[PDB]
């Protein structure tokens, strides 16, 4: 959870980026299911997307 | 002091005991070779702290002669035990229906603006008479009936439009007039009205 | 002054049931409210159940004596017979302590060890024995039989030399109901029932039925010609009218089972289903059994019979379909472990029994009352 | 122990001999009197404070003038008992109100006698109430002074006699006057209470659909009264619009969730004593303008 | 505490304090009795604090 | 001139409670006047704010007009199951005080979580540092998507630094009295609120003659605290018990 | 010796017994219809016991407590269908409903509980919408 | 009383309603506690002689 | 109604069940407390066509 906070502080640090709400929910969900559903690679893969 | 004298009396008259009973029960627990048997025995000793039952939604047919497998069972939707749908501990967001709330206020205020325009159409230099409007809108008929009620119930002759425009009533009672609208007709005495400066 | 059975009477009855007893010092409002209807409640308890209820100045307790004790009824936090033995020894100790007397945990351990009446000695140097005593002490503290403020026994867990300062509270005297005879004459627990039913000879059958119905989630038909179930049939209807007037429940009756359903469970109430996943898997199993009535022929008693092997195959099949949505705890556990836990759980709610010797599984019709599944969009995402 | 009857008889002789020496009735009476006397002083203190409170209630109801040509006043006083078997509380109350300056040892004895009669009455009540309720309850009933006194509301119209407010007297009121008589005690209680409060307190009230039926002029007057006292309030109604000139300023909110719709729509108005505009709330309008 | 608060006995020895207390009681000058109820630390429950 | 500086109520919010999705209400100065057809919540709303938000007791009796226990606050929090297909919610209620003749604001609000027939949490808070919800403070971050009400922990951190957050109705009531009302006792505050519930109860609007008022006033007077009777009763009971023994 | 049992059947649904839960599932109009039509049917049957020339009369005070504006329209249609002659009173109702074939009204004003009464008279005829 | 409730039931079922909700009514006879009693319906059966 | 259908003016006909809460005397006279009119003579009549 703290890492999630850091992730969305990394997001919230780039205001020039218009991360819609939907992509933010996607990221939230991808974090919520770490190592039970998807490893981190799918998370940072979408961030990089 | 009084408590102490009372204690002397109780000391004279009191005293019981049950300890040894515990020991036989403890020995029996020694004989309890499995914890379910032990739970049963403990329940003998004391009873259940609570009770077990199942929740349901509604009553069912009372066919004594039929069993559940014949019955259609109580099919349940199971919130998946995976976040793969949504498995939640932290709070959810409020829907943020600001669009819908704004639309509702807009529509309500627009209906009331239509009503206000209608009242304005009927404000003849700040005066209205019921007989002059023998043909009326349903809304204006109900408004004027409310005006009659407000003025006659309140001997002050005061009357209120929902917009804050006050109204004081002039009165006269020897008449029979008819009022026509979309729904029905009504036969009534007449009344007169004027508007005040609470605008 | 003429009181009537209303929401308040139902609430007081429910509070009495779903707790072992009510203490004045913490639930003064409930105690007073209960006291107000206590008159109607005593009469009513006598009329329907025949159960006694003793209300005194510091607490109120309802002697929920079951017709036939069942494993889930007992204090569940306890896990071994030894826990109960230590509990009884603790009781004896409190018999040795005067009211508001203060004693150290170390003293309690020593006297319990000395008095412990079993042939096989209790040793405090072990970890497991200490865990049993700590659980016993936790339950004791729960009923305020003993108060505790200095330290925390939990350190006692990893430090047997640990110490705490305890104070014996008044409730220890009154905790346990009375046993009017020479208790030794009760050479075996079965003899207790013969007492409670020598006290309930008048219309014993109705009181028996009321206790069985009200305590257990359900009441299972002994056989095709069970006299009790025929009795239940004769006064099913009058029971239903009474139940609608008097309680939360809604009656259901079938050929091989009868039970009370509950419409709105509060915070303090216990109900099935609940959060524990095993209920979910029990429901999934219920649906799977419902789906093949002919392969798993319900026998005349409404039971469905499966062997341990057949059950293990079913659990594997279930892990295949719904396992994708199970908690990682069960998803990660072997078939036999899941089998043991689910079968114990299903015993607690009286859904089924596993014959120890022949390994036959008896699934009661009450199990077949309810079936569960995941939402369809996920079921297709998981295992379409 | 299991002992022979000789031993038990001897033991009971010795014990009864010892137990009998513990106490004497005279000491019982003395202890009871001294504690009851301090309790009586405490009761005196409570009566004095309550009397000041009632004086305040009457003062607040009296210290303004209402548009209906009316002024209100409330009064407190001890009732007379049914009979002297209950030693009538009015005599003891007379003694209690009696100025300490005017007090004397005889009056102190009389008050103590009254308390003695009450304690005897308490024990008899214990016997009659075989319900087994503790002596504490019977005492809390016998000594509760609020039951001993009664209120009498009074109104004095312009150049008309002051009157006691019996139901019939209530009926002598006009309709609006009846409403004031019923709904003034509440305001005076909550206002005296706040005067009891600290210097931080905001004088809050809450009116629930009040006055449906009252003629617009009089509910106007009710608001005039609320203005005089200086209340801040939250009122709800189905048809009330709050456009009465006695309301210096006011905010009116309209709730909307019609037809089962699942969202509540708030339509915020405003008032200033003369007119009621349609408000688009300033700060939140600017917030809507900015946030995007 | 209060003896040490007085500068003259800032270094006051409490063992000497209790010796002096016992001497005074023995000298028919003081009284004391063990506390029966008020223990917060287990040591207080042990120590019969007079 | 005034005394030390009286409070005034100008604002009142709701956040994800009942059908109150996100609503707020300004007060002219300290006055406000709700209206709407009956059964819409103009009463449930007023009841939630007063005196409920004043002390925090939430038992069914305070909200209930009959004084019975028909429907709980929880039911309002979760909403009718026939309308909202939910069994878990988190609602926030709050009011925003301004000190009359000054520009100091104290806020007070409740945060609740309820799960349909599964148990209701509650946490209380009071802000006194002159932060205003919605101007230099916020209750629902838009992070993770839309506006999301703070969960208990984030709200506790954020207020905790600048204001107090408490988890028991008693402590919250003591805080509210201490800051806003300045009653010379907490009990007196409770008794005032007791009077206020009666003030609010609808028997006023309905019953019209005096003998109701006399009972109300007689009930307003403060009785004998159990201690004063306790000494006398204990002594007399012990003495009579000794006599009987 | 007996007890009364009501049974309700929503369109195309299995017969039941009119419990509280089935009640809560009703809409406002359905609720009003179920509670008050039975009562007026009881009155009707009782009048069936009556003679031939009896005017089947019913009454209501604070008429139609908790009913939606539409079924109140329905109620006056139902009343016309049954043919009742009725004297009702109501604080908020106005009797201006299209389904009323005809209806006299009178307004009693006595707000001041003082002992005077002011009486206003009207009449209504309705225009049931013939399509 | 039976006649009254019977005519009641006939009327209630015959006339359809604007709400779409139909109501029917019946008198449920209590059931006997001990075999010395009759179900009230049967009791009425006997009682009709 | 139903008072003028038969003429039993006793409180049982006024109260929705039959109680004695409100009485015919005040209805004829006007309420007891509101007015001093302890005596009066009156008539009531309905017309049927």
d(CA I48, CA I46): 7
Would the CB atoms of C267 and F119 count as touching at under 8 Å?
Answer: yes
Q: Are strands G118-124 and D149-155 parallel, antiparallel or unpaired?
A: unpaired
Pick from F210, F221, F178, F203: nearest CA to D193: F221
- What's the CA angle centered on G88, arms G86 and G89, to 5 degrees? 165
H in contact with A (at least 3 C-beta pairs within 8 A):
no
Phi-psi category of residue H20: left, alpha or beta, with phi > 0 → left and psi -120 to 50 → alpha: left
Q: Distance between CA E49 and CA E39 in Å, rounded?
A: 9
The values of phi and psi at residue B174, to 5°, are -160, 90
Candidates B4, B6, B10: best to mutate against F (most CBs of F within 10 A) is: B6
User: Is the Cβ pair C102, E40 closer than 8 Å?
Assistant: no
Residues of A in contact with B85 (CB under 8 A): none
Q: Within the 14-43 window of chain A, which residues sit less than 8 Å (CB to CB) from chain B?
A: 29, 32-33, 36-37
D123: closest CA among B7, C56, F239, F245? Answer: F239
Rounded distance, CA F86 to CA C264, Å? 15
DSSP secondary structure letters along F67-110: SS-SS-HHHHHH--TTT---SEEEEEEEEEEEETTS--EEEEEE
- What number of other Cβ atoms are within 10 A of residue B161's Cβ? 19
Phi first, then psi: give them for residue C167, nearest 5 degrees. -130, 130
Residues H4 and G41: their CA atoms lie apart, in Å, by 10
Place of tokens 């707020």: F24
Q: How far is CA G50 from CA C226, F244, G57, H25, in A?
A: 54, 73, 11, 21
- Enumerate residues 6+ apart whose C-beta is below 8 A from B114: none
Resolution, Å (one decimal): 6.7
**Residues counted in chain H:** 49
Identify whether the C-beta of residue F120 lies closer than 8 Å to the C-beta of residue F59. no
What's the rounded Cα separation, in Å, for the pair C287 and H13?
Answer: 40
Calculate the CA G83 to chain-centre distance. 12
State the pairing for strand pair F140-141/F148-149.
antiparallel
Secondary structure element (H or E) that encloses residue G81, with its range:
helix G69-82
Rounded to whole angstroms, how far apart are CA atoms F225 and C331?
61
What crossing angle do the helices spanning B19-31 and B35-45 adopt, rounded to 10°? 160
Helix (H, G, I), strand (E, B) or coil at C362: strand
Longest Cα–Cα distance of chain I, Å, equals: 39
Beta bridge partners, F98, equal F8, F105
| E-state strands within C238-303 | 249-253, 257-262
Of all helices (H) and strands (E), which one includes residue C85?
helix C81-96
What sign does the CA torsion over E9, E13, E14, E19 have?
negative
Do residues D60 and D188 lie in contact, with contact meaning Cβ atoms separated by under 8 Å?
yes
C-beta of residue D182 within 8 angstroms of C-beta of residue F204: yes
**Is residue C314 within 8 Å of C288, Cβ to Cβ?**
yes
Among B74, F82, B57, F114, which residue's Cα sits nearest to residue C264? B57
Distance between CA E33 and CA D8 in Å, rounded?
36
Q: Within 10 A of C225 (CB to CB), how many other CB atoms are there?
A: 8
Burial C134-143 (b: 16+ CB within 10 A, else e): bbbbebbeeb
- Torsion sign (Cα): I10, I14, I15, I16: positive
Chain A residue numbers with beta carbons less than 8 Å from the beta carbon of B83 are: 29, 32-33, 36-37
C-alpha span between C251 and G22 (Å, rounded):
16
Contact H11, G45 (CB under 8 A): yes
Q: How far apart are CA C202 and CA D69, in angstroms?
A: 75
Q: Are F206 and F215 in contact (CB under 8 A)?
A: no
Q: Where are the alpha helices (DSSP H) in F27-184?
A: 42-49, 52-55, 60-63, 73-78, 152-162, 169-176
Judged by phi (left if over 0) then psi (alpha if -120 to 50, else beta), residue C306 lies in beta
Which residues from chain A sit within 8 angstroms of residue B82, using beta carbons? 33, 36-37
Contacts of G33 in chain H (CB under 8 A): 17-19, 21, 23
> Is G81 at the interface with chain C, CB within 8 A?
no
In this complex, whether C and H touch, counting 3 or more CB pairs under 8 angstroms, is: yes
User: Contact C102/E41, CB-based, under 8 Å?
Assistant: no
What CA–CA distance (Å, rounded) separates F15 from B150? 38
User: What kind and span of H or E run contains C354?
Assistant: strand C352-354
Instruction: Spell out the residues 6+ positions from residue F63 whose beta carbon is closer than 8 angstroms to its own.
Output: F44, F47, F48, F52, F71, F72, F73, F76
Element (H, E) at H10: helix H2-14
Identify the helix (H) or strand (E) that includes residue H12.
helix H2-14
Give the whole-angstrom CA distance, residue C11 versus residue C246: 11
Nearest to C215 by CA among C41, C363, C51, C37: C51
| B101 → closest Cβ in D217, D263, D275 | D263
State whether residue B62 is helix, strand or coil. coil
Q: How far apart are CA F213 and CA F232, in angstroms?
A: 33
For chain G, the residue count is 131
Within 10 A of C45 (CB to CB), how many other CB atoms are there?
Answer: 18
- Residues 31-90 in F contacting D (C-alpha not used; CB under 8 Å): 31-38, 40-43, 45-46, 49-51, 54, 79, 83-84
Place of tokens 């309690």: C108
Cα four-point dihedral sign D110, D113, D117, D123:
positive
Cα–Cα distance for residue pair C22/C59, rounded to 1 Å: 6
Hey, what are B20's tokens? Answer: 């040894």
Give yes or no for a contact between B52 and C217, defined as CB atoms under 8 angstroms apart. Answer: yes
Beta-carbon count within 10 A of H23 CB: 20
User: Helices F226-244 and D105-128: crossing angle, nearest 10°?
Assistant: 70
Contact by Cβ (8 Å): D253, D266: yes
Q: Are strands C249-253 and G103-109 parallel, antiparallel or unpaired?
A: unpaired
In angstroms, the CA C261 to CA C265 distance is 11
Number of residues assigned to chain B: 199
| Paired strand residues for D74 | D153
Q: Do chains F and C touch (3 or more CB pairs under 8 A)?
A: yes
> Is residue G122 within 8 Å of residue G103, measured between CB atoms?
no
In the three-class reduction of DSSP (H, G, I as helix; E, B as strand; rest coil), residue F219 is classed as helix
Please compute Rg for chain E using Cα positions. 13
d(CA D243, CA D249): 9
What token pair was written down for I21? 């809460």
Distance CA E4, CA E27 (A): 24
Cα–Cα distances (Å) from A46 to A14, C177, F138, in that order, read 16, 66, 30
Detail the DSSP E strand segments found in B20-165: 54-55, 74-77, 127-129, 158-160
Q: The tokens of C301 are what?
A: 């008693």
Three-state SS letters, chain D: CCCCHHHHHHHHHHHHHHHHHHCCHHHHHHHHHHHHHHHHHHHHHHHHHHHHHHHHHHHHHHCCCECCCECEEEEEEECCCCCCCCCCHHHHHHHHHCCCCCCCHHHHHHHHHHHHHHHHHHHHHHHHCCCCCCHHHHHHHHCCHHHCEEEEEEECCCCCCCEECCHHHHHHCCHHHHHHHHHHHHHHHHHHHHHHCCCCCCCEEEEECCCCCCCHHHHHHHHHHHHHHCCEEEEEECCCCCCCCCCCCECEEEEECHHHCCCCEEEEECECCCCCCECCCHHHHHHHHHCC
- The CA-to-CA distance between both ends of chain D, in Å, stands at 91
């Amino acid at each position: 959870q703290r890492l999630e906070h850091q992730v969305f502080t990394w997001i919230e640090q780039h205001p020039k980026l218009i991360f819609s709400n939907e992509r933010r929910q996607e990221i939230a969900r991808s974090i919520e299911g770490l190592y039970e559903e998807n490893r981190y690679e799918q998370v940072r893969e979408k961030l990089l997307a | 002091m009084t408590r102490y004298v009372q204690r002397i009396g109780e000391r004279q008259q009191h005293f019981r005991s049950r300890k040894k009973d515990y020991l036989q029960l403890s020995k029996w627990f020694v004989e309890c070779r499995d914890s379910e048997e032990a739970h049963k025995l403990s329940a003998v000793v004391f009873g259940s702290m609570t009770i077990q039952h199942l929740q349901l939604e509604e009553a069912t047919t009372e066919n004594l002669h039929v069993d559940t497998w014949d019955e259609a069972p109580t099919e349940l939707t199971i919130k998946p035990r995976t976040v793969r749908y949504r498995e939640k501990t932290k709070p959810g967001s409020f829907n943020s229906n600001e669009q819908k709330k704004k639309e509702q206020r807009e529509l309500y205020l627009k209906e009331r603006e239509q009503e206000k325009k209608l009242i304005e159409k009927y404000m003849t230099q700040g005066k209205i008479t019921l007989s002059a409007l023998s043909t009326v809108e349903p809304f204006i008929r109900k408004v004027l009936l409310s005006w009659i009620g407000k003025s006659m119930a309140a001997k002050n002759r005061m009357v209120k439009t929902d917009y804050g425009l006050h109204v004081k009533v002039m009165l006269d009672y020897e008449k029979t007039i008819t009022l026509q609208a979309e729904d029905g007709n009504l036969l009534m005495p007449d009344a007169t009205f004027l508007f005040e400066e609470t605008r | 002054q003429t009181q009537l059975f209303d929401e308040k009477a139902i609430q007081g009855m429910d509070i009495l049931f779903h707790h072992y007893w009510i203490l004045r010092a913490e639930q003064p409002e409930w105690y007073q409210l209960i006291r107000e209807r206590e008159k109607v409640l005593r009469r009513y308890l006598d009329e329907k159940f025949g159960l006694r209820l003793i209300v005194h100045q510091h607490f109120i307790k309802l002697e929920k004596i079951p017709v036939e004790p069942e494993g889930w009824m007992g204090i569940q936090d306890f896990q071994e017979p030894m826990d109960y033995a230590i509990f009884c020894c603790a009781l004896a100790f409190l018999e040795g302590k005067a009211v508001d007397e203060q004693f150290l945990l170390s003293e309690l351990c020593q006297e319990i060890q000395a008095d412990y009446p079993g042939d096989f000695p209790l040793d405090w140097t072990l970890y497991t024995h200490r865990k049993s005593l700590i659980r016993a002490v936790k339950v004791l503290m729960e009923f305020q039989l003993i108060r505790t403020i200095d330290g925390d026994i939990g350190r006692f867990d990893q430090n047997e030399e640990q110490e705490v300062l305890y104070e014996a509270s008044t409730y220890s005297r009154y905790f346990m109901r009375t046993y009017p005879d020479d208790f030794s004459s009760y050479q075996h627990w079965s003899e207790l029932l013969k007492e409670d039913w020598k006290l309930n000879q008048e219309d014993e059958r109705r009181k028996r039925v009321y206790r069985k119905l009200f305590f257990s989630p359900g009441l299972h038909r002994l056989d095709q010609q069970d006299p009790d179930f025929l009795y239940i049939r004769n006064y099913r209807n009058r029971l239903a009218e009474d139940i609608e007037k008097h309680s939360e429940y809604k009656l259901h009756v079938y050929k091989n089972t009868a039970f009370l359903s509950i419409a709105e469970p509060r915070q303090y109430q216990q109900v099935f289903p609940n959060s524990k996943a095993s209920t979910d898997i029990i429901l999934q199993l219920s649906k799977y059994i419902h789906g093949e009535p002919e392969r798993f022929k319900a026998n005349e008693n409404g039971e469905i019979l499966m062997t341990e092997g057949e059950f293990e195959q079913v659990v594997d099949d279930l892990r295949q379909q719904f396992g994708t949505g199970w908690a990682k705890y069960f998803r990660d556990m072997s078939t036999k472990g899941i089998r043991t836990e689910l079968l114990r759980a299903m015993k607690d709610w009286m859904m089924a029994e596993v014959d120890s010797e022949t390994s036959l599984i008896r699934i009661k019709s009450l199990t077949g009352v309810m079936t569960g599944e995941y939402p369809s969009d996920f079921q297709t995402g998981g295992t379409e | 122990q299991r002992v022979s009857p000789y031993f038990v008889f001897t033991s009971l002789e010795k014990e009864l001999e010892d137990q009998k020496g513990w106490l004497d009735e005279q000491d019982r009476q003395l202890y009871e009197d001294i504690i009851v006397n301090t309790v009586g002083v405490i009761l005196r203190n409570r009566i004095k404070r309550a009397e000041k409170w009632v004086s305040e209630m009457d003062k607040i109801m009296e210290s303004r003038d209402n548009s209906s040509g009316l002024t209100f006043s409330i009064a407190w006083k001890p009732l007379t008992a049914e009979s002297e078997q209950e030693l009538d509380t009015k005599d003891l109350v007379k003694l209690l109100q009696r100025n300490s300056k005017f007090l004397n040892e005889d009056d102190l004895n009389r008050i103590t006698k009254h308390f003695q009669s009450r304690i005897g009455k308490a024990k008899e009540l214990i016997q009659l109430r075989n319900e087994g309720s503790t002596l504490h309850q019977v005492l809390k009933e016998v000594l509760d002074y609020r039951k001993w006194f009664t209120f009498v509301l009074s109104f004095k119209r312009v150049n008309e006699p002051k009157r006691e407010l019996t139901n019939n007297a209530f009926f002598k009121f006009s309709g609006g006057e009846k409403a004031m008589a019923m709904y003034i005690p509440l305001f005076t209680a909550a206002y005296s209470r706040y005067k009891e409060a600290g210097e931080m307190a905001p004088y809050i009230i809450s009116l629930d659909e009040a006055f449906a039926g009252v003629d617009e002029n009089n509910i106007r007057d009710m608001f005039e009264v609320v203005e005089q006292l200086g209340f801040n309030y939250i009122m709800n109604s189905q048809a009330l619009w709050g456009d009465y000139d006695t309301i210096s300023s006011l905010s009116i909110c309209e709730l909307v969730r019609p037809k089962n719709a699942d969202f509540v729509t708030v339509i915020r108005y405003q008032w200033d004593g003369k007119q009621r505009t349609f408000v688009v709330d300033d700060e939140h309008v600017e917030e809507l303008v900015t946030h995007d | 505490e209060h003896m040490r608060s007085i500068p003259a006995f800032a270094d006051f020895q409490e063992d000497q304090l209790h010796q002096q207390l016992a001497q005074l009681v023995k000298w028919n000058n003081l009284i004391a009795r063990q506390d029966m109820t008020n223990a917060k630390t287990i040591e207080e429950y042990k120590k019969k604090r007079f | 001139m005034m005394t030390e500086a009286k409070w005034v109520m100008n604002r009142a919010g709701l956040l994800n409670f009942w059908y109150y999705d996100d609503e707020i209400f300004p007060f002219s100065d300290g006055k406000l006047l709700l209206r709407g057809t009956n059964g819409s919540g103009k009463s449930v709303t007023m009841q939630s704010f007063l005196p409920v938000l004043l002390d925090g007791k939430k038992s069914p009796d305070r909200l209930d007009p009959f004084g019975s226990k028909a429907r709980r606050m929880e039911d309002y929090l979760l909403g009718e199951k026939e309308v909202v297909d939910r069994d878990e919610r988190t609602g926030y209620l709050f009011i925003e005080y301004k000190k009359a003749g000054v520009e100091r604001y104290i806020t007070t609000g409740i945060g609740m979580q309820a799960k349909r027939h599964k148990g209701i949490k509650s946490w209380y808070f009071v802000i006194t540092d002159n932060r205003r919800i919605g101007y230099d403070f916020e209750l629902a971050h838009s992070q993770l998507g839309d506006r999301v009400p703070f969960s208990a922990k984030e709200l506790e951190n954020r207020i905790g630094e600048g204001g107090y957050v408490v988890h028991t109705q008693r402590e919250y009531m003591e805080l509210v009295n201490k800051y806003i009302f300045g009653f010379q006792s907490n009990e007196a505050y409770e008794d005032l609120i007791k009077l206020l519930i009666q003030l609010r109860s609808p028997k006023l609007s309905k019953d019209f003659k005096p003998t109701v008022i006399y009972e109300i006033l007689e009930s307003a007077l403060p009785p004998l605290t159990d201690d004063e009777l306790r000494h006398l009763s204990d002594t007399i009971e012990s003495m009579d018990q000794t006599q009987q023994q």
